[PDB]
Amino acid sequence: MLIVPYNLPLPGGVVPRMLITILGTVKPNANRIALDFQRGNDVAFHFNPRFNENNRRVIVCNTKLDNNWGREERQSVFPFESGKPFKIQVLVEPDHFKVAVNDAHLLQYNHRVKKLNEISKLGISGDIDLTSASYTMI
Template identity: 35%
Template sequence: KNKNRQNSRMAIYEPVSDIFNTIPVMSIEGGLKEGKSVIIIGRILPDASRLHVNLQCGSDSKADIALHINPHYENDSAHVMYNTYKNGTWGSEQSTPDSPFVKDKLFAIEILVTKEAYKISANGKHVMDYEHRIPITQVNTISVDQNIELEFIESFYSKQLVPYKTLINGGLQPGNNILIYGVPNTDSKRVEFNLRHRYGIAFHYLSLFDENVVVCNTSENGKWGAEERSGGVPFLKGQLFQVKISCSREHYAVFVNGQQAHTYKHRFTKLDDIDVFEVYGQLQLIFVHV
């Protein structure tokens, strides 16, 4: 499906689900291996005082924990603790100040497995190299605190790089949603999404930071139509965003961080001919679900 990564993934869960209230642990298909990454995307509940994300050895409540990521919020002093639980005992803690995990806001954790350490990034920024204390071959489970409303968990091998292109199996259909998570670079000039078919672009969504404008358009046989421009780029440089492009029979609706930002009436109406999604611009692409 995606040429930029191997198809070695866990189950992907839709963001509206409450399933995580009853499934606090999830298995990692094939276990952890060098070069593999795990991405966890979610939102921290506003009344959370502390929470955790664990990479652990099995799903038992007493299982060893190879990596314990533990944001704290006591006394308005946000920080993150990292540790390992082995043979019934916690090891020495490591910490980072200025937690990137903000209550009631979307976050994305990426954990890259290397030979020596877990390279941990949050919201597109590297925060910690945590050296292995338990062999990665023993790690096969993710445990997530119930103070986190999860949107997605996925394990994969190669990063999603920009320019990015992926196929839409079977073509676009009414009711389909495309979800994009990313972080515009601090010097970003544009963020661009395209829904493409064989003869052109059915939906072109372009945010221009310098002009603070969003441009929507359609191109067929090399010719662009009339632009639809609206003021106010819905992204902030350096900050994580979630975009959902929802396709109905009449139009596309674009939601940014849960708020409807734009609608665009179909000009190209053969929706099932639309079979490619593209991302361009100056941004770090964290995750795409088509």
């Protein structure tokens, strides 16, 4: 298994048609998972499944600019399960990140950070066994 937290460099940042694939298994008693697409210290796209926020499961997405979190976007559709293998795919589109989990569309997150070619790191962290993290063009 890969080390968590894991850094995946994104050389020259992201661009529309870039597909990022994360394979792993959720730990049995999970609390949270995070993907952080970073531009230096800023987080262009934070994707944060929470398994127990007020006894509900929710996806929180946000952006961090100058060390400050912005307005959260919430998705109540929650395809993860403690103990189970998952595939997260993040497809960069012109106006948004598109996320599919286990080959089913989950959400989109509109670009707040404009300089896509400076979003040069993906951090992966939280309650997972991480199998692989990769990217390709489509």
